[PDB]
């Protein structure tokens, strides 16, 4: 499978700025032609952990890329660690190894490659999450489909602020969206 | 079925202002009592294609109506073209229009018809999409259930901008919501 | 089952400020590891029915708590009435009470208890609903998971305004979100 996730375990699984500096809590759940997605992010390390824009005003956005082969396995030059990401059983993920989740991938027809044809804005799903769950502390999470090259399919999360933040931990609220499946 | 959609093909399928001037990319996917919906809009023609509010400040909202008989077939005086809209098999629809679509329709109990009784606002699901996928360029998408007359069921999208736009193509981001099913 | 709901009937089922003063229209629908949730609120009685902030500027937020035992039955010191809340069969509920809908519950792993650790903000799902479906009249709906004590699981809705409202009926638009299931 119903579900292809990174375990909810919060053992860091994502490399933004330095090795295993973050936990991306992505959960994809197939309902026929739509994948239902729930996403969250805890930076625990280095750049992007604590934000001081009085210090570093240049720092106010970053990116996490998920790339996939013709089959839909995570290509290990994705920001996300390949081991934790696999179809879920219970509190774990069937262990074994991931293979053949096509149609967990976003539809190429619906969400074309940049090369294949002129892209429209339906490729994108803007959402807003909140740092520390504080209403005064929002940030944007622009999810973008099959727009990376060096892969057959992409999901790519772009995080951005626009507010000058002084000592704010980048741990987000949950956000939910859907996209159209390849099959 | 799982899914009732307009093909993602982007061959114009919707009549807002003039014949086939737009592509409504609606995708309904039944999860028991809830329909999970993903919606997008590309205007390609005439009024509402390029927005100049310096020229036409009066122009900042329009409407797309989906009407359904007792059975849940699109009544062909809906803004959406009746041919492209049918239960999905592959990237097409078996290309013979459906007969038994009910319970893709929004619940009359939950979302009543405009009776004498006190009407509550739970009929409505406000969302925000973004023109050209630009954060500076938002617009509203008020989805409204079973409030149109001359039909048994309605889904109706109301698009509005508070913002004075100078030469902006009305092509939207994806937006996802859910409603309660009739059956 | 697919669905665990409060009937869509407008018969008050929730106690905010005084006995049965409100109708919470909560609808949980299991798609594997994610619950897809649709929520609405009609206050019909007493404090929080009509809002005058010229009169009572102190009044601009309130809370509805859903509590669950190890098994996932609503504990009857929840704001929501235990009788109307049960797995859906037609537009009714088989009128025989459920025990142990676990995995309609939010995951403890994902959404931990306030257990003496660093708590992260992924517990929370901020949304905005609109009073009377009027764009000028928004309110916030901070949904928060497993953060209440005297229970094994919690869903808790926090409603807040920040705008001075003069004679506004607190009846909301629908709002849709998802959380990760326990199992």
Residue numbers in the entry:
A (entry chain B), B (entry chain A), C (entry chain C): 187 to 369
Pull text from the paper.
HAdV-D10 is a rare serotype isolated from the eyes of patients with conjunctivitis. HAdV are non-enveloped viruses measuring 90–100 nm and arranged in an icosahedral capsid with protruding fiber proteins at the pentameric vertices.
We investigated binding of HAdV-D10K to known adenoviral receptors CAR, CD46, and DSG2 by using surface plasmon resonance. HAdV-D10K was able to bind to all three receptors, but the interaction was weak for CD46 and DSG2 (KD: 20 and 125 μM). We demonstrated that HAdV-D10K forms a stronger interaction with CAR than CD46 and DSG2 (0.44 μM). This is still considered a weak interaction in comparison with CAR binding to HAdV-C5 knob (0.76nM). We conclude that, although the binding is weak, HAdV-D10 can bind and use CAR as an entry receptor. Although several binding sites were identified, we determined that HAdV-D10K forms weak interactions with CD46, insufficient for cell entry.
